From TrEMBL, chains B, D:
Source species: Adeno-associated virus 9
Gene: cap
Compartments where located: Virion
Family: Belongs to the parvoviridae capsid protein family.
Superkingdom of origin: Viruses
Protein name: Capsid protein VP1
C-alpha cells in the first residue's frame, strides 16, 4: 500500500471449536545480510574437520528461511494442556501464512558509531518452494524457529543445503541450486506476502497411553482351548502337555507380538556411578551408509526403560532438550531435559533390552537346547507398535524422502510424515549496490549498502481433534501444574524477562484399551 | 528383486504349437496313439506394441546433469551396431539413473 | 488379391498434351538375397585399400532399392527428340510408383542341379523413406537404374551407405541404421504396392542454347556515351581517352560478366600426341575436406572448349558415359562417350582457360604495370551463367544436402536440386528359416531357404513444358537421325538383341536471345 | 561470422541515463551551462523474457548419440557453480552440435 499504512495486524490467539482448534501466532523477525549477498561452497575442509563420518560438501546461500516446525510455535502451554488432557488424537489440517509490516533499514558507520535509518525504496524477496525443488532442511530439528513466547524477537536462520560428497570433494552427480533462479515476490515497506497450504491426509497422533499390555489381553478367568509343552523329562523323552490358563499367562497363545527393536546401550543418570571406559561413541548403536557411520538417533520407537527404572535412558534413543540458558558443549545432566517413552512399554520393546530369545540349534540326547538373544528384530507379521510421542518443544512434521519404497514413514524424531509437507519459505534482502565507479568495469559489484530488514510474521494452522469416548470409571492421569510455592511460575518469565520451558510435555495422559 | 515392475496380473503367457500332422496310418485299425508324423516346422512374424507413460523432470538444478553418451574416440566398430560378419552386440549394460533429484 | 489374379497391368507409354507430357515406364525386376539377410560393417580395410583419400567406413544392408534417376528410364529416344526439339524448358511435376505381380521363388540344389519352385506363402517387404531419415544414395550416378529398353530385365541394386570415418575406423558420431526399424508393407504374390509423390517447385531446365554472347549484347551501329583510357605515353604521362564504339567492342562498358570458374587441365583426344608425364591425378583440379583430396568432377558448369577446339576436353569437367559393352577398367577413348558443354560458351568461361587478368601492383615511372591470371574466380555481383546440360542417359535429380547455407543448389552433374526429392524405395525378401533344431538354441538362425523374387515395377512422371515463342526467321538446329545407310539402326537392338545408345543426347538445340 | 542470427531489425538498443540534478546555482544569472551537479547513481532490477522455438529430432539412428554430460569423477568444485569465495565460473565453452543427422 503505502509507507504510512500498516500492511497487517497482530493476530495471536487460539480458537477451540468442537472437533477443531485453530492456532494463530505472530512474531517479530529480523533479517540480516547473509554471506554478503554471495553463494559460497562449504565443506568439512572449509570448517577444518577431517573425520570421514563428519565429511560433507554443500553451499551456503544469502537467503534466510522461516521455520515454524515446533509445537510451541503455535500452542501456548495452557492450550497444549487442554489438547493433551481432553483429546485422544490430533493432526494438522490447513495452513495460513502472512508476512507484513516490512521495514528495511540501512546502517552507516562513520567512526566507531553506527547510524540506522529507513530505506523506503529497498525491497525484500520472498518465495515458497511449493514444487519442492530445493533441498528440504525443515525435516531436521534445527534452531531458528518462531519463539515459544510471542514477545520474543527472533533472527531468521540462514538457508544452507548439502549435496553428494566424497570426503571434502564433490562428484559429478552433486547439484548446485541458485535460489535467484526461482520467481519471487519483491516487497517494499508497503507490500505484504501471504499464501495458504493444505496438509495432506495423515493419521491422528496417538495422544493416549494404553491401559492394557500386549501380553495381558486374555480373560484372566477362563482357560484357553490350546495346549503347550510343559514337561519333557521324567526327572527318556516324556512329552507332557498342559492347558494354558490364568495361572501361566506367559505361555498362552497370542495373536499379536510387540513391534521391532534396535537395541540401545543403557546409561544411568545417577551421580557417583563409575564407568568402565569412555563409551559414548564406541558403545553407540549405529547405521552405515556408503562407508559413513551415523549414530542411531533416536532410532525406532522403543520403551525408554522398564517399570521402576526411570534412572536409565537409552544412549541415543530419546530426544534431549536443553534448559533455558544451557551451553552448547559439554553440559551436565541437570542442564538438559531427557525425554522418555515409558508410555509405549505396553506394545513396544524396551530400548535397552533384547527383543527376545530364538532357538539356535536342534536339541537331542547329546546336545542341550540352545537359545540366542535377539538384539535387533525387523518387522514381522502380527507386530503392533506405537510411534514416538510428540512434545510441546518438539518437531511437528517432516518430509518423507522421495524414494521407491518406505515403511511406516512416521518421522523417527516424532510428528507427521508427509510427501508434500508445508513448503519452505525463503526470504532475502535485495542487494543495494553502493556508488559504482564512473568508468565501466565488467566485474560484479562487491560494494553494497549495509542493510537489514524487520517485520512481523503470522502463521495460522487449523487442527482436527479426536475426542475421547472412554467408559473408564476411575479418573484419568492429567497434566497439571504444582500448587506448591516457588520463586517463579512455570512457563513464565523470570525477573529479567527471560522465558523458560521447565520440562518437556508429552501428549499421552489419557488412556484407552489395546 | 531382479528389477522391473511387479504385477498380480502381468502380460499373459502366449503359447504356440504346431498341430501334429500324422503320416499314413495302417489300413487295419490299431487303438494305439499315432507315433508317425510328418516332420514340420513353422515360421512367421510377431509384432508387439507397448505404450509407456513418462514422468518428466522439473529440476531446478543449475549445473548440467550426468548423461549417457557415446564416446567420439575412433574405434574399429560402432557401439551397438553390427560387426564385419553381421553380428550385433551390446557392449555394455545401460541403466536408467543419470538424472538427479533431491532426497 | 489371390494367387491366380494379376495385381497390375503393363503400362508403358508417353502422352503429349499441350504444356505437359506424361511418361509411363514398366520394367521386370529380379531381387536376390543380399548379404544372406545380414547387416555387415564395411570399410576400406575390408576391401583391402590403404590410401587415405579412398578411406571409408559404413554398412551393407540386405535391402535392395529401386532407382529411376536417369532420363532414359522414362523418355524413349523419339520422345526425347520431341522434347528437345520443341521445348525451351521442362521440369518434373508429380510421380506415381507401383509394384505388382510379386513372384517369390525358392531354389533347391541337390547335386550340381538347381530346382526353382514358387513359394506362395513368402513375403517381400517394401517401404519408402518419405521422411528422408536414411542416407540418400540416389544423388550419385550409380548403376542399377531401370533399363532404357523396356524389354530388358534388370537386377535390383543392393542398398549401402557410408558414415563418418577416420581411416578404416569409425568415430562416436558415426551412425548405424537398421532398415527393419522402419514400418514396411509385406506383400505376398497377391499383393501390390503404390504411392504418389509431388515434386517440389524447381526452375525449368535450360533446353536452349543462347544465340547471343555476353560480350556482344550492344548495338553494333551506335557509340557508347562512355569513355575508356586509350593511350598513356607520347611515344610523360599523356592520358588519352576515346569513345567506346563498334570498332572496339572489347573495351565497351558492360553490365554483366561471365559466371564463376575453376580451371581444368586440358586433354587432347588426338592419338599420337606425346604426353610429358603421367598427369591424370598429379595434374588434376581438386578440393580437400578433412585432409581427404577429392577430384573436382564435374565441377562448376564451364564451356568444355573454345570455338573450333572440339578435340580438347577438361580432365574432369565433363560427364563421361560408356558405350554398350565397354569394360570397367582402362578402356580406350573410342569405348567411351565424352560429353561437352560448348553451348554455354556464350555465358560461361572456358573450363581449360583462366577467367581473366587482374592487376597485381601499382604502375609508376619505375615499375611497369603487372597483371596476374585468375585460375579460379568466385561468385561476383552481376555474374550470369548457365547450368550443366542434362542428357538422355544422365541423372534427373539430386538431394540438396541439409546444411545451413548453399548457393544455387543445381546438381553439378546436371538435373534438378531438391530439398525433398523422390523418396528412396527400399525392397527386401523376408528371410524364410530352414528347419530349426528340435532343441531350443538362443543363437539367431543362420540356415535359411534360398529365395529370390521377381515382379514388375511401374513409374509415371508428369512433366511440365515451356514452349518456345521465338521470332527467329532462319530455321533452328534440330537433333536428327542420319539417313545414310548403316548396318544397324541407332537406338535399336543388334542382331543379338543387345540394345545400345550410340551417343549422348543433350537438350540444347533451340535458341533464344541472351 | 561470430555466430548467431542475423537480422535487419534485431532487438532494439535500450538506452538508460540518470537525469542530471544541478547543485545550488548562483543567485545571479549566468548564461553558461551548469557544471555543478549532485553526485548520483541508480540501481534496480531488469527482466528479459525470450520465447524460443524448438526443432525436434526425428532420427532413425540405432546406436546412441553423443551427448554433453558432466563428469562424475570427484573434484574440489562443481562445474558451473560457485567457489568457496562465491565466484561463479564457466569452466569450458559449450557448443550446440552433439546430435547427428544425415547430410
Amino acid at each position: 500500500d503505502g509507507v504510512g499504512s500498516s500492511s497487517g495486524n497482530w493476530h495471536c490467539d487460539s480458537q477451540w471449536l468442537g472437533d477443531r482448534v485453530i492456532t494463530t501466532s505472530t512474531r517479530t523477525w529480523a533479517l540480516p545480510t547473509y554471506n554478503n549477498h554471495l553463494y559460497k561452497q562449504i565443506s568439512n575442509s572449509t570448517s577444518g574437520g577431517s573425520s570421514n563420518d563428519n565429511a560433507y560438501f554443500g553451499y551456503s546461500t544469502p537467503w534466510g528461511y522461516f521455520d515454524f516446525n515446533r509445537f510451541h510455535c503455535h500452542f501456548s502451554p495452557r492450550d497444549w494442556q487442554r489438547l493433551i488432557n481432553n483429546n485422544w488424537g490430533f493432526r494438522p489440517k490447513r495452513l495460513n501464512f502472512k508476512l507484513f509490516n516490512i521495514q528495511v533499514k540501512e546502517v552507516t558507520d562513520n567512526n566507531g558509531v553506527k547510524t540506522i535509518a529507513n530505506n523506503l525504496t529497498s525491497t525484500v524477496q520472498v518465495f515458497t518452494d511449493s514444487d519442492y525443488q530445493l533441498p528440504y532442511v525443515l525435516g531436521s530439528a534445527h534452531e531458528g524457529c518462531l519463539p515459544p513466547f510471542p514477545a520474543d524477537v527472533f533472527m531468521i536462520p540462514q538457508y544452507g543445503y548439502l549435496t553428494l560428497n566424497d570426503g571434502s570433494q564433490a562428484v559429478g552427480r552433486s547439484s548446485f541450486y541458485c535460489l535467484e533462479y526461482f520467481p519471487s515476490q519483491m516487497l517494499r515497506t508497503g507490500n505484504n506476502f501471504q499464501f495458504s497450504y493444505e496438509f495432506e491426509n495423515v493419521p491422528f497422533h496417538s495422544s493416549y497411553a494404553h491401559s492394557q499390555s500386549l501380553d495381558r489381553l486374555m480373560n484372566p478367568l477362563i482357560d484357553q482351548y490350546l495346549y503347550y509343552l510343559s514337561k519333557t523329562i521324567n526327572g527318556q523323552q516324556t512329552l507332557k502337555f498342559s492347558v494354558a490358563g490364568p495361572s501361566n499367562m506367559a505361555v498362552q497363545g497370542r495373536n499379536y507380538i510387540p513391534g521391532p527393536s534396535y537395541r540401545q546401550q543403557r546409561v544411568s543418570t545417577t551421580v557417583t556411578q563409575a564407568a568402565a571406559s569412555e563409551f559414548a561413541w564406541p558403545g553407540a548403536s549405529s547405521w552405515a551408509l556408503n562407508g559413513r557411520n551415523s549414530l542411531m538417533n533416536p532410532g525406532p520407537a522403543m520403551a525408554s526403560h522398564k517399570e521402576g527404572e526411570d534412572r536409565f535412558f537409552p544412549l541415543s534413543g530419546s530426544l534431549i532438550f536443553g534448559k533455558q540458558g544451557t551451553g552448547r558443549d559439554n553440559v551436565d545432566a541437570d542442564k538438559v531435559m531427557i525425554t522418555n517413552e515409558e508410555e509405549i512399554k505396553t506394545t513396544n520393546p524396551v530400548a535397552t533390552e533384547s527383543y527376545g530369545q530364538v532357538a539356535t540349534n536342534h536339541q537331542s540326547a547329546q546336545a542341550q537346547a540352545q537359545t540366542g538373544w535377539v538384539q535387533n528384530q525387523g518387522i514381522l507379521p502380527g507386530m503392533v507398535w506405537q510411534d514416538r510421542d510428540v512434545y510441546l518443544q518438539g518437531p511437528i512434521w517432516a518430509k518423507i524422502p522421495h524414494t521407491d519404497g518406505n515403511f511406516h514413514p512416521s518421522p523417527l524424531m516424532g510428528g507427521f510424515g508427509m510427501k508434500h509437507p508445508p513448503p519452505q519459505i525463503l526470504i532475502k534482502n535485495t542487494p543495494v549496490p553502493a556508488d559504482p565507479p564512473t568508468a565501466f568495469n565488467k566485474d560484479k559489484l562487491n560494494s553494497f549498502i549495509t542493510q537489514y530488514s524487520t517485520g512481523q510474521v503470522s502463521v495460522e494452522i487449523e487442527w482436527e481433534l479426536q475426542k475421547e469416548n472412554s467408559k473408564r470409571w476411575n479418573p484419568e492421569i492429567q497434566y497439571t501444574s504444582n500448587y506448591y510455592k516457588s520463586n517463579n511460575v512455570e512457563f513464565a518469565v523470570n525477573t529479567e524477562g527471560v522465558y523458560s520451558e521447565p520440562r518437556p510435555i508429552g501428549t499421552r495422559y489419557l488412556t484407552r484399551n489395546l
